[PDB]
Amino acid sequence: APMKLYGAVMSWNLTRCATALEEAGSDYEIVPINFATAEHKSPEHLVRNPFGQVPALQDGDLYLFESRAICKYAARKNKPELLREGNLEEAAMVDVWIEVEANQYTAALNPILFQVLISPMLGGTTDQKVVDENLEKLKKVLEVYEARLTKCKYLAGDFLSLADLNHVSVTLCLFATPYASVLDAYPHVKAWWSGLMERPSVQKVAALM
Amino acid sequence: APMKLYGAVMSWNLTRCATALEEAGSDYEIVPINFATAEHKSPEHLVRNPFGQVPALQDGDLYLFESRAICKYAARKNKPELLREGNLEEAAMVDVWIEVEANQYTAALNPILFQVLISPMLGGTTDQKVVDENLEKLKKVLEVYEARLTKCKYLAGDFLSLADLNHVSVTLCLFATPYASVLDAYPHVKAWWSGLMERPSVQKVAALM
CA angle in degrees (0–180, nearest 5) for A121-A125-A126: 100
Any idea what DSSP says for residue B7? S
Dist CA B139 CA B141 (whole Å): 5
Question: How many other CB atoms sit within 10 Å of the CB of residue A54?
Answer: 23
Dist CA B73 CA B17 (whole Å): 10
Residue A126 C-alpha, separation from nearest chain B C-alpha, in angstroms:
26
Q: What is the residue type of A163?
A: A
CB-CB neighbors (< 8 A) of B76 in chain A: 88, 91-92
Q: What is the residue type of A167?
A: H
Alpha carbon A178 to its chain's center? 20
Contact A170, A106 (CB under 8 A): yes
Beta-bridge partners for A65: A56
Q: Using the beta-carbon criterion (under 8 Å), do A95 and B88 form an inter-chain contact? A: no
Contact B204, B9 (CB under 8 A): no
* Helix axes B67-78 and B12-23, enclosed angle (nearest 10): 10
Dist CA B166 CA B19 (whole Å): 7
The dihedral built from the CA positions of residue A117, A118, A124 and A130, taken in this order, carries a sign that is: negative
The bridge status of strand B3-6 relative to strand B56-59 is antiparallel
Q: Which of B72, B88, B92 sits opposite A95 (nearest CB)?
A: B72
Contact B105, B139 (CB under 8 A): no
Q: Using the beta-carbon criterion (under 8 Å), do B95 and A50 form an inter-chain contact? A: no
CB-CB neighbors (< 8 A) of B68 in chain A: 95, 99
Dist CA B182 CA B196 (whole Å): 17
Contact B36, B86 (CB under 8 A): no
Task: Please indicate if the annotation marks A53 as binding a ligand.
Answer: yes
Phi, psi of B57 (to 5 degrees): -125, 135
CB-CB neighbors (< 8 A) of B98 in chain A: 69
Q: Using the beta-carbon criterion (under 8 Å), do B91 and A76 form an inter-chain contact? A: yes
Number of H helices, E strands in chain A: 11, 4
Any idea what DSSP says for residue B46? G
Dist CA B205 CA A27 (whole Å): 44
Dist CA B135 CA B182 (whole Å): 9
Query: Of B172, B162, B163, which is closest to residue B193 (Cα–Cα)?
Result: B172
How far separated are the first and last CA of chain B, in Å rounded?
A: 25
CB pairs < 8 Å spanning A and B: 70
Domains of chain B: 2-83 (3.40.30.10), 84-206 (1.20.1050.10)
Contact B97, B163 (CB under 8 A): yes
Dist CA A59 CA B136 (whole Å): 33
Experimental method: X-ray
Residue of B nearest to A145 (CA): B50
The dihedral built from the CA positions of residue B155, B156, B161 and B162, taken in this order, carries a sign that is: negative
Any idea what DSSP says for residue A87? -
Task: Please indicate if the annotation marks B54 as binding a ligand.
Answer: yes
Resolution expressed in Å: 2.5
Spell out where chain B has E strands: 3-6, 28-31, 56-59, 62-65
The H or E element spanning position A74 is helix A67-78
Residue A77 C-alpha, separation from nearest chain B C-alpha, in angstroms:
7
Q: Which class for B182: exposed (0-12), middle (13-18), buried (19 or more C-beta within 10 A)? A: middle
Q: Using the beta-carbon criterion (under 8 Å), do A88 and B69 form an inter-chain contact? A: no
How many Cα atoms within 13 Å fall on the side-chain side of residue B15? Answer: 21
The dihedral built from the CA positions of residue A50, A52, A55 and A60, taken in this order, carries a sign that is: positive
CA angle in degrees (0–180, nearest 5) for A182-A188-A193: 70
Any idea what DSSP says for residue B79? -
